[PDB]
Enzyme design. Structure first.
Site, PDB file in Angstrom:
ATOM      1  N   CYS B 148      42.117  50.408 -37.319  1.00 21.28           N
ATOM      2  CA  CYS B 148      41.980  49.002 -36.934  1.00 21.28           C
ATOM      3  C   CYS B 148      43.327  48.291 -36.835  1.00 21.28           C
ATOM      4  N   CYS B 153      40.991  47.466 -33.830  1.00 19.65           N
ATOM      5  CA  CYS B 153      40.498  46.092 -33.741  1.00 19.65           C
ATOM      6  C   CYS B 153      41.616  45.051 -33.566  1.00 19.65           C
ATOM      7  N   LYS B 156      43.588  45.562 -30.247  1.00 23.30           N
ATOM      8  CA  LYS B 156      42.536  45.428 -29.250  1.00 23.30           C
ATOM      9  C   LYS B 156      42.199  43.958 -29.040  1.00 23.30           C
ATOM     10  N   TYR B 290      32.186  51.113 -26.384  1.00 22.83           N
ATOM     11  CA  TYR B 290      32.733  49.772 -26.455  1.00 22.83           C
ATOM     12  C   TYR B 290      34.246  49.808 -26.359  1.00 22.83           C
ATOM     13  N   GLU B 294      36.081  47.561 -23.573  1.00 25.13           N
ATOM     14  CA  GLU B 294      37.058  46.605 -24.103  1.00 25.13           C
ATOM     15  C   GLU B 294      38.425  46.797 -23.455  1.00 25.13           C
ATOM     16  N   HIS B 565      25.784  20.141 -31.609  1.00 21.64           N
ATOM     17  CA  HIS B 565      25.985  19.930 -30.194  1.00 21.64           C
ATOM     18  C   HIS B 565      27.355  19.306 -29.946  1.00 21.64           C
ATOM     19  N   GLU B 570      24.029  26.746 -30.684  1.00 24.28           N
ATOM     20  CA  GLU B 570      22.879  25.879 -30.885  1.00 24.28           C
ATOM     21  C   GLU B 570      21.670  26.311 -30.080  1.00 24.28           C
TER      22      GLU B 570
HETATM   23  C1  LIG Z   1      40.069  51.079 -30.086  1.00 24.39           C
HETATM   24  C2  LIG Z   1      39.257  50.884 -31.370  1.00 24.39           C
HETATM   25  C3  LIG Z   1      38.889  49.568 -31.550  1.00 24.39           C
HETATM   26  C4  LIG Z   1      38.161  49.192 -32.695  1.00 24.39           C
HETATM   27  N1  LIG Z   1      37.768  47.763 -32.888  1.00 24.39           N
HETATM   28  C5  LIG Z   1      37.016  47.393 -34.051  1.00 24.39           C
HETATM   29  C6  LIG Z   1      36.634  45.966 -34.215  1.00 24.39           C
HETATM   30  O1  LIG Z   1      36.932  45.176 -33.372  1.00 24.39           O
HETATM   31  N2  LIG Z   1      35.905  45.595 -35.397  1.00 24.39           N
HETATM   32  C7  LIG Z   1      35.520  46.615 -36.408  1.00 24.39           C
HETATM   33  O2  LIG Z   1      34.934  46.283 -37.360  1.00 24.39           O
HETATM   34  N3  LIG Z   1      35.921  48.017 -36.248  1.00 24.39           N
HETATM   35  C8  LIG Z   1      36.646  48.374 -35.055  1.00 24.39           C
HETATM   36  N4  LIG Z   1      37.028  49.750 -34.869  1.00 24.39           N
HETATM   37  C9  LIG Z   1      36.657  50.728 -35.900  1.00 24.39           C
HETATM   38  C10 LIG Z   1      37.676  50.646 -37.060  1.00 24.39           C
HETATM   39  O3  LIG Z   1      38.976  50.918 -36.575  1.00 24.39           O
HETATM   40  C11 LIG Z   1      37.223  51.695 -38.054  1.00 24.39           C
HETATM   41  O4  LIG Z   1      35.875  51.462 -38.491  1.00 24.39           O
HETATM   42  C12 LIG Z   1      38.166  51.657 -39.255  1.00 24.39           C
HETATM   43  O5  LIG Z   1      39.537  51.625 -38.902  1.00 24.39           O
HETATM   44  C13 LIG Z   1      37.956  52.949 -40.003  1.00 24.39           C
HETATM   45  O6  LIG Z   1      38.303  52.712 -41.392  1.00 24.39           O
HETATM   46  P1  LIG Z   1      38.507  54.109 -42.202  1.00 24.39           P
HETATM   47  O7  LIG Z   1      39.002  53.698 -43.516  1.00 24.39           O
HETATM   48  O8  LIG Z   1      37.277  54.911 -42.167  1.00 24.39           O
HETATM   49  O9  LIG Z   1      39.557  55.083 -41.348  1.00 24.39           O
HETATM   50  P2  LIG Z   1      41.036  54.679 -40.680  1.00 24.39           P
HETATM   51  O10 LIG Z   1      41.223  53.189 -40.490  1.00 24.39           O
HETATM   52  O11 LIG Z   1      41.160  55.465 -39.382  1.00 24.39           O
HETATM   53  O12 LIG Z   1      42.133  55.234 -41.857  1.00 24.39           O
HETATM   54  C14 LIG Z   1      42.165  56.642 -42.100  1.00 24.39           C
HETATM   55  C15 LIG Z   1      43.693  56.912 -42.525  1.00 24.39           C
HETATM   56  O13 LIG Z   1      43.845  58.054 -43.139  1.00 24.39           O
HETATM   57  C16 LIG Z   1      44.922  58.884 -42.310  1.00 24.39           C
HETATM   58  N5  LIG Z   1      44.703  60.314 -42.608  1.00 24.39           N
HETATM   59  C17 LIG Z   1      43.906  61.216 -41.951  1.00 24.39           C
HETATM   60  N6  LIG Z   1      44.010  62.385 -42.583  1.00 24.39           N
HETATM   61  C18 LIG Z   1      44.873  62.212 -43.629  1.00 24.39           C
HETATM   62  C19 LIG Z   1      45.326  63.085 -44.579  1.00 24.39           C
HETATM   63  N7  LIG Z   1      45.013  64.487 -44.756  1.00 24.39           N
HETATM   64  N8  LIG Z   1      46.167  62.709 -45.533  1.00 24.39           N
HETATM   65  C20 LIG Z   1      46.584  61.416 -45.558  1.00 24.39           C
HETATM   66  N9  LIG Z   1      46.151  60.536 -44.612  1.00 24.39           N
HETATM   67  C21 LIG Z   1      45.301  60.935 -43.649  1.00 24.39           C
HETATM   68  C22 LIG Z   1      44.706  58.533 -41.079  1.00 24.39           C
HETATM   69  O14 LIG Z   1      45.888  58.861 -40.146  1.00 24.39           O
HETATM   70  C23 LIG Z   1      44.511  57.003 -41.249  1.00 24.39           C
HETATM   71  O15 LIG Z   1      45.721  56.347 -41.442  1.00 24.39           O
HETATM   72  C24 LIG Z   1      37.809  50.137 -33.675  1.00 24.39           C
HETATM   73  C25 LIG Z   1      38.203  51.467 -33.508  1.00 24.39           C
HETATM   74  C26 LIG Z   1      38.894  51.828 -32.374  1.00 24.39           C
HETATM   75  C27 LIG Z   1      39.320  53.358 -32.220  1.00 24.39           C
HETATM   76  C1  LIG Z   2      32.162   9.072 -28.654  1.00 16.80           C
HETATM   77  C2  LIG Z   2      30.846   9.604 -29.229  1.00 16.80           C
HETATM   78  C3  LIG Z   2      30.860  10.976 -29.358  1.00 16.80           C
HETATM   79  C4  LIG Z   2      29.721  11.648 -29.844  1.00 16.80           C
HETATM   80  N1  LIG Z   2      29.739  13.136 -29.978  1.00 16.80           N
HETATM   81  C5  LIG Z   2      28.579  13.809 -30.486  1.00 16.80           C
HETATM   82  C6  LIG Z   2      28.627  15.289 -30.613  1.00 16.80           C
HETATM   83  O1  LIG Z   2      29.626  15.874 -30.324  1.00 16.80           O
HETATM   84  N2  LIG Z   2      27.452  15.963 -31.095  1.00 16.80           N
HETATM   85  C7  LIG Z   2      26.238  15.196 -31.481  1.00 16.80           C
HETATM   86  O2  LIG Z   2      25.297  15.769 -31.863  1.00 16.80           O
HETATM   87  N3  LIG Z   2      26.193  13.737 -31.330  1.00 16.80           N
HETATM   88  C8  LIG Z   2      27.381  13.077 -30.852  1.00 16.80           C
HETATM   89  N4  LIG Z   2      27.364  11.643 -30.719  1.00 16.80           N
HETATM   90  C9  LIG Z   2      26.140  10.918 -31.082  1.00 16.80           C
HETATM   91  C10 LIG Z   2      25.142  10.997 -29.904  1.00 16.80           C
HETATM   92  O3  LIG Z   2      25.722  10.427 -28.747  1.00 16.80           O
HETATM   93  C11 LIG Z   2      23.931  10.211 -30.363  1.00 16.80           C
HETATM   94  O4  LIG Z   2      23.386  10.744 -31.580  1.00 16.80           O
HETATM   95  C12 LIG Z   2      22.876  10.266 -29.260  1.00 16.80           C
HETATM   96  O5  LIG Z   2      23.388  10.001 -27.967  1.00 16.80           O
HETATM   97  C13 LIG Z   2      21.891   9.165 -29.555  1.00 16.80           C
HETATM   98  O6  LIG Z   2      20.617   9.548 -28.976  1.00 16.80           O
HETATM   99  P1  LIG Z   2      19.602   8.280 -28.874  1.00 16.80           P
HETATM  100  O7  LIG Z   2      18.450   8.795 -28.135  1.00 16.80           O
HETATM  101  O8  LIG Z   2      19.349   7.713 -30.206  1.00 16.80           O
HETATM  102  O9  LIG Z   2      20.389   7.015 -28.124  1.00 16.80           O
HETATM  103  P2  LIG Z   2      21.288   7.042 -26.714  1.00 16.80           P
HETATM  104  O10 LIG Z   2      21.760   8.427 -26.329  1.00 16.80           O
HETATM  105  O11 LIG Z   2      22.432   6.055 -26.905  1.00 16.80           O
HETATM  106  O12 LIG Z   2      20.170   6.490 -25.556  1.00 16.80           O
HETATM  107  C14 LIG Z   2      19.687   5.154 -25.708  1.00 16.80           C
HETATM  108  C15 LIG Z   2      19.404   4.687 -24.194  1.00 16.80           C
HETATM  109  O13 LIG Z   2      18.620   3.645 -24.132  1.00 16.80           O
HETATM  110  C16 LIG Z   2      19.411   2.519 -23.330  1.00 16.80           C
HETATM  111  N5  LIG Z   2      18.840   1.214 -23.722  1.00 16.80           N
HETATM  112  C17 LIG Z   2      19.227   0.376 -24.737  1.00 16.80           C
HETATM  113  N6  LIG Z   2      18.416  -0.680 -24.723  1.00 16.80           N
HETATM  114  C18 LIG Z   2      17.526  -0.503 -23.700  1.00 16.80           C
HETATM  115  C19 LIG Z   2      16.497  -1.285 -23.253  1.00 16.80           C
HETATM  116  N7  LIG Z   2      16.039  -2.565 -23.751  1.00 16.80           N
HETATM  117  N8  LIG Z   2      15.731  -0.920 -22.234  1.00 16.80           N
HETATM  118  C20 LIG Z   2      15.985   0.266 -21.623  1.00 16.80           C
HETATM  119  N9  LIG Z   2      17.014   1.052 -22.048  1.00 16.80           N
HETATM  120  C21 LIG Z   2      17.784   0.665 -23.081  1.00 16.80           C
HETATM  121  C22 LIG Z   2      20.649   2.707 -23.667  1.00 16.80           C
HETATM  122  O14 LIG Z   2      21.643   2.035 -22.700  1.00 16.80           O
HETATM  123  C23 LIG Z   2      20.731   4.255 -23.596  1.00 16.80           C
HETATM  124  O15 LIG Z   2      20.803   4.708 -22.284  1.00 16.80           O
HETATM  125  C24 LIG Z   2      28.555  10.943 -30.191  1.00 16.80           C
HETATM  126  C25 LIG Z   2      28.528   9.555 -30.036  1.00 16.80           C
HETATM  127  C26 LIG Z   2      29.655   8.907 -29.583  1.00 16.80           C
HETATM  128  C27 LIG Z   2      29.585   7.320 -29.426  1.00 16.80           C
END
Ligand SMILES: Cc1cc2nc3c(=O)[nH]c(=O)nc-3n(C[C@H](O)[C@H](O)[C@H](O)COP(=O)(O)OP(=O)(O)OC[C@H]3O[C@@H](n4cnc5c(N)ncnc54)[C@H](O)[C@@H]3O)c2cc1C
Ligand SMILES: Cc1cc2nc3c(=O)[nH]c(=O)nc-3n(C[C@H](O)[C@H](O)[C@H](O)COP(=O)(O)OP(=O)(O)OC[C@H]3O[C@@H](n4cnc5c(N)ncnc54)[C@H](O)[C@@H]3O)c2cc1C
Ligand SMILES: C=C1C(=O)C=Cc2ccccc21
Ligand SMILES: C=C1C(=O)C=Cc2ccccc21
Ligand SMILES: [K+]
Ligand SMILES: [K+]
Lengths: 587, 587
Positions: B148, B153, B156, B290, B294, B565, B570
């Site tokens: 890894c 990993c 990669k 994979y 990758e 959101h 979500e």
């Molecule tokens: C391209 C590639 C991408 C991968 N990407 C991921 C990922 O994204 N996420 C994930 O979870 N896993 C990933 N894996 C798997 C991950 O690399 C392995 O699961 C992990 O490295 C293995 O752990 P290990 O301890 O079994 O062996 P290794 O990490 O291979 O360690 C074994 C060590 O012992 C050495 N050795 C061998 N024989 C001897 C010896 N006689 N004496 C002393 N030393 C020795 C070896 O040379 C090595 O250094 C990937 C593997 C590959 C090939």
């Molecule tokens: C800058 C900002 C960023 C935000 N970012 C997030 C976020 O990232 N994630 C998240 O989950 N929430 C976020 N929120 C909160 C989210 O916008 C509110 O929780 C959600 O929009 C409110 O839903 P609502 O139905 O209560 O009211 P609103 O979405 O405000 O709808 C009420 C509607 O009724 C209208 N209305 C009012 N009075 C009347 C009337 N008498 N007659 C007819 N229509 C009327 C209003 O003009 C409006 O159109 C954010 C809020 C703000 C201000």
């Protein structure tokens, strides 16, 4: 059970009781499908107490067989009476018979209201959605879809993305890309135009969606004058009245202004920021909400000269250790903070150039807690000093919908107001997390209880959040301080660690700035009471863990789970340093 | 219980039985701390059956009080006998007395072996870690840390990141950044140099870490000649023998070559790719693992002309619907596939330029299943046609460590080989997911069972994975086809949806390509049997959900949870289209 059943029968617009293994039911279904009659369906063979239900149904129908079809509280018939009605082409007028113009009127076409509207119409509820967008002081307005779509989460995160790409451009060079950064600049108006074009596609997609579910959409200001009557003012000022069985209030909130000379005339809010025709330029954000810091953060990453004026603390109501780390990252990456400072007045020095799309110029006068004067020039001044509902504009006080001291609607745990056919969802529902997915889930689940006999309530506990500051902050559950207040220090263990995204190594970004912690309860099997993470993609990290926490995850459940490598999130599966141990979380 | 206790006493190098509320224990602790004597500690007041344990201890010590200190299977004393030993400065020789040179020898300094080594030394086990990196055919070699760290990993994912930044550069323009893309190119050797500099910091950090835990590190090839004897060949060819109580085999695997003329002489593997001194240029990847996809994916995103030669299917052993979607994204984004094709020979047309760091040139001849000849020129040919252990190079067959038909070590569920003091972890442990975090958790948990009396086993079920193809693919649990095979089609419901990252809207990337599904068991409360997601940051998305699935998540647990959101993750909280319903998953 019979309490459940009479609520269901009374409330559904068009509902069919039925069983899976019932050919007469199917022939009712098919006649209605063929008739384009939408309806709810309860398959009694799939409920543990369908037998009790089938029996209690005789209290409504005088019969105990399936199929049983009801319309607006009244039995309509078995199979034969429905076909009778169909073949006589009387079925349309039957299923359209109502004391009211609509089964449901939603006031507010935002996140909650559109979701409730669409879901209700699915079960036959004749639905109208009202939406009107009262302009901001400078005349900004926008289309259907509410705050998130138009002036919130959607444009906010898109501009965050534009900010993150700044750092992608920097990182690109270390990963081998030949890039002349001295000749790269950002064009505010090109970004806004792309952001606004996606918003317009959402405005339009929501209209289309309402059309496709036979929801009536009225771009009109609604006012509830009695339990079942809504007075609508249209584009023209033409006034009329419509009636509905159930009313859902989903009107959201609008930004507050501080009560100081010049604020309304010369400042802007987030309402205006996301379609602003000119680059804001040197900007002052007044506030310390997640809105304030999100906006300051992306403006700074776009190259802007940005200052945040903070009265007391950052992100009141969030874990304060995490808020400080959020703030510290922004300070070390271009955001200036005028700490312990409030504004006294905004004076205009230049008017906005409507012609060349250039900002004006403003003098902000204020004072620090230490008595020193604040006086500085900014091209743009943004207020993010909280939001408030405007319900006197929607609620004749005569109707009897009770509000709290902050003007929000006081509700039962099923979203019912003190007027029993009137519900409130989203930001105006007092005491609930003010978040778009909460409002969607509330509106949809409510719609199902009203119109399809469901019982599931919305669970507002342990709702995860993410603040999209330059370095993102995701949380689920309690802050460390609230857990201690609730249970006492002796009963709280906190596991934590710094971490470094692999992406940051070659890019030469910071060790020991990203950070996560689990706040746990010693006496309840080290139950995870709150999860906190500061780092890239913090919302993607946090979301899955919210399911586990909802199920009662403990530290041991985290430890048992194997990491995905290489990821930031995997560090939650190997935490071992506790705060009490005094050992450093750095790596 | 006494079975547990005699295993523990026999195996620990230096262990103290104790209670929290015991001043003589503390004074033993402090004398040992002050003496720089590392040890395990079991606080009997914190185990439900500490009483039974304290009693059964008399079978080992003739006493029943705490503190009780043991060294390598033998009672050493209570408080007074320890201070006696300390004050006479006999304690060093006592805790260093052993039949063997080491309590633990780890053969292999990779993910599993370094983790097991470090954790064991924490509890007083005198530990040596052996690592040697046999060169690749072209002479590539690298430092401490295993596959890894050096050739897996870590590099990669860093090169994946360099590929993703390609698309960041494209996206940047739509988000408003003024960028001359016609004058941007990628420099392979600058990227490799940054990648290799981070690897070197890991090689060095592991050496340092071993030093700081008093682990002996021997850059030497180990060979187990009897249960307790390891024969080491050093850099010089000097041969010697060391002895150890417990042996951990953690030697990993190496890439396979196809048995065709030219493969060894002119091709390369992933072992060579990640330090390759020259840009590979027009590349052919032979394989469909994979690893194959990758590597092809990032080479293509760096601008490369890339072809993947596939014998049958993509990603055998993964959900095949997801594999196809992975493959389809790569095909539509620059990767060519020679489908149903195998190689027959590699002919050299140009030798690698060691001087200007330019690739050579190769003619690949092969044949398709339809009989047509494959013949094409490539500058680089990469084999990723699987990996295999090399245990005859490590295991004298006389020792009695049983191997399976694939050359991997047959183990009990506590990693014990058929030689009872010899364990195997990581890729050579037959039947286990071949993943770095599995090997780390196995090595650490094993070390705790050996040397600190722990009982927890590693849980190899539902281990989440992510494939870091251009569009990433994360999974936890069963593929859809394996769930059907296990439980039958009638008992499987699959909920699914397309989705579009918000980041992709303004960037003009694809609708309805990202995709997720939950594979559920109807008869077990819609238990989530497998989770699958194709999209950006798929490992960050998937990880948290692995905790919930480990706890037995159902569809209802997903639905109850509120979304964050706006995020990709979500969408798992609002899925409703089933496959059986035949309704389209597009949005
Ligand atoms: C391209 C590639 C991408 C991968 N990407 C991921 C990922 O994204 N996420 C994930 O979870 N896993 C990933 N894996 C798997 C991950 O690399 C392995 O699961 C992990 O490295 C293995 O752990 P290990 O301890 O079994 O062996 P290794 O990490 O291979 O360690 C074994 C060590 O012992 C050495 N050795 C061998 N024989 C001897 C010896 N006689 N004496 C002393 N030393 C020795 C070896 O040379 C090595 O250094 C990937 C593997 C590959 C090939
Ligand atoms: C800058 C900002 C960023 C935000 N970012 C997030 C976020 O990232 N994630 C998240 O989950 N929430 C976020 N929120 C909160 C989210 O916008 C509110 O929780 C959600 O929009 C409110 O839903 P609502 O139905 O209560 O009211 P609103 O979405 O405000 O709808 C009420 C509607 O009724 C209208 N209305 C009012 N009075 C009347 C009337 N008498 N007659 C007819 N229509 C009327 C209003 O003009 C409006 O159109 C954010 C809020 C703000 C201000
Ligand atoms: C505690 C803070 C911090 O750490 C960084 C910035 C900041 C700004 C305003 C108020 C408080 C802070
Ligand atoms: C099924 C495939 C696919 O969808 C795309 C590419 C591919 C390449 C080789 C084998 C199979 C496929
Ligand atoms: K773990
Ligand atoms: K949900």
């Amino acid at each position: 059970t019979s309490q459940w059943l009479r609520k269901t029968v009374d409330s559904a617009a068009v509902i069919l009781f039925s069983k899976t293994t019932c050919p007469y039911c199917k022939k009712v279904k098919d006649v209605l499908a063929e008739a384009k009659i939408k309806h709810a369906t309860i398959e009694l063979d799939q409920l543990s107490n369908g037998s009790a239900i089938q029996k209690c149904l005789a209290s409504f129908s005088k019969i105990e067989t399936v199929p049983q079809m009801f319309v607006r509280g009244k039995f309509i018939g078995d199979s034969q009476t429905v076909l009778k009605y169909y073949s006589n082409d009387e079925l349309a007028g039957i299923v359209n018979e109502s004391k009211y113009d609509y089964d449901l009127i939603v006031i507010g076409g935002g996140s909650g209201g559109l979701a409730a509207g669409k879901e209700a119409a699915k079960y036959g509820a004749k639905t109208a959605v009202l939406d009107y967008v009262e302009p901001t002081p400078i005349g900004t307005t926008w289309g259907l879809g509410g705050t998130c779509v138009n002036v919130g989460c959607i444009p906010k995160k898109l501009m965050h993305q534009a900010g993150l790409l700044s750092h992608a451009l920097e990182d690109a060079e270390h990963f081998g890309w030949s890039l002349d950064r001295s000749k790269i600049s950002h064009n505010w108006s090109t970004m806004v135009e792309g952001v606004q074009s996606h918003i317009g596609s959402l405005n339009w997609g929501y209209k289309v969606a309402l059309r496709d579910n036979q929801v009536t959409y009225l771009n009109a200001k609604g006012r509830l004058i009695s339990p079942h009557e809504v007075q609508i003012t249209d584009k023209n000022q033409k006034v009329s009245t419509i009636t509905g069985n159930k009313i859902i209030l989903a009107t959201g909130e609008r930004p507050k202004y501080p009560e100081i000379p010049g604020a309304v005339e010369y400042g802007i809010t987030s309402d205006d920021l996301f379609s602003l025709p000119y680059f804001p330029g040197k900007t002052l954000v007044i506030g310390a909400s997640y809105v304030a810091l999100e906006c300051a953060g992306f403006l700074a990453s776009l190259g802007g000269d940005v200052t945040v004026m903070v009265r007391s603390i950052l992100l009141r109501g969030f874990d304060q250790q995490m808020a400080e780390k959020v703030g510290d990252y922004m300070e070390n990456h271009g955001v200036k903070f005028a700490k312990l400072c409030v504004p006294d007045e905004i004076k205009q020095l230049k008017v906005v150039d409507t012609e060349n799309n250039k900002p004006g110029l403003l003098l902000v006068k204020g004072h620090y807690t230490d008595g020193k004067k604040f006086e500085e020039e900014f091209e743009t001044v943004i207020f993010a000093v909280g939001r408030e509902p405007q319900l006197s504009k929607v609620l004749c006080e005569t109707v009897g919908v009770k509000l709290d001291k902050n003007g929000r609607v006081v509700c039962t745990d099923d979203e019912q107001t003190t007027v029993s056919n009137v519900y409130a969802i989203g930001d105006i529902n007092a005491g609930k997390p003010q978040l778009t997915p909460v409002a969607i889930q509330a509106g949809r689940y409510l719609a199902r209880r009203l119109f399809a006999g469901a019982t599931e309530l919305t669970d507002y506990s342990n709702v995860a959040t993410t603040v999209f500051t330059p370095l993102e902050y995701g949380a689920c559950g309690l802050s460390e301080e609230d857990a201690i207040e609730k249970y006492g220090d002796k009963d709280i263990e906190v596991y934590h660690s710094n971490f470094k995204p692999l992406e940051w190594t070659v890019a030469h970004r910071e060790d020991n700035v990203c950070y996560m912690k689990l706040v746990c309860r010693k006496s309840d099997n080290m139950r995870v009471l709150g999860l906190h993470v500061l780092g890239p993609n913090a919302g993607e990290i946090t979301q899955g863990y919210a399911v586990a926490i909802k199920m009662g995850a403990t530290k041991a459940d985290f430890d048992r789970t194997i990491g995905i490598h290489p990821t930031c999130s995997e560090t939650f599966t190997t935490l071992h340093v506790t705060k009490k141990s005094g050992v450093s979380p750095i790596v």
